[model samples]
Target: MISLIAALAVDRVIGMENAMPWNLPADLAWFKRNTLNKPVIMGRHTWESIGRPLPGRKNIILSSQPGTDDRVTWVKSVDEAIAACGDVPEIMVIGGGRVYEQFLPKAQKLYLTHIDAEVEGDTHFPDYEPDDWESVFSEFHDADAQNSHSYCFEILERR
Candidate 1:
């Protein structure tokens, strides 16, 4: 299965200066839970933001950079990254805006967190055509001392 996963604010803002504007452990935990064992595909900038390979899954980076360590494999395009995933049950496209935009249309499932705040960001999640997708599941979370914002985790499927 090809899937796209991300968390964005009400304004569809995703990143600021290559990092998330807010830190939400609950959302991060949710992301890790869903994507942990899957092959994760991301652009070079996203990889840099993360600093190192995510511990439990296969990390495939889209970049012109040469050299592959045990932690990561480099690919040049979205097609190549998906091809690398091969027989895996699902390949997760995690992003910066460009990577998400490239894979969103081809993705069968979307695991997204719709944050309840507007943020200043240079990167934004691409808008999807509402008629082409339907929400399959949704769970709301309220802001608390540990979490800075209220959000909803929603799973969307292409129609």
Candidate 2:
């Protein structure tokens, strides 16, 4: 199945100037552990932001760029991106804003980190109106007691 994993701030902000606005360690670890050794699909900018390839998992970059590592694959369109998922037990759609918009409709499951505070951001997640998806599960984590930022993890299913 195709799944998307991401964290967003109130107002649905996902990034600011190409970088995440919050310091969320627990969320990060959860992302890494869950996605490890699986196939991850991302856009050119998402791949560029990492600086280097993540080990253990196969990386597929949907970009116009050419030539790269064996673990790295490239595709030119959203259909091609979906095709890359092919028969894998799960495909993780890691992101940047544009890529998420392109893949959201076909995604079966979503691992979303929803932050409590609002902040100005340059990029926002695509609008998936409530009628389109149902919240299957949700867990809240408090930033005040933990002395970190507040956020909630939500698992969504296509309605």
Strongest candidate by lDDT: 1
Candidate 1, residues 1-159, lDDT tens digits: the string is: 889999998789999998998889999899999999899999989998888889899999998777455569899877789888889988999998999999987899999999988789899999888889999999999999999899999999989
* Residue pairs in candidate 2 whose N, alpha carbon or C atoms collide under 3 angstroms: none
Q: Give TM-scores for every candidate, taking all chains together and pairing residue i with residue i.
A: 0.95, 0.89
Off by over 4 Å in 2: 67-71, 144-147
In Å, residue 15's CA in model 2 sits off its true spot by 0.9
Q: What TM-score should be assigned to candidate 1?
A: 0.95
- Local accuracy of candidate 2 as per-residue lDDT tens digits, 45-91: 87878767888877889987674655577888888877876778889
133, model 2: CA deviation in Å? 1.7
Quote the positional error of residue 3 for candidate 2 in Å.
Answer: 1.2
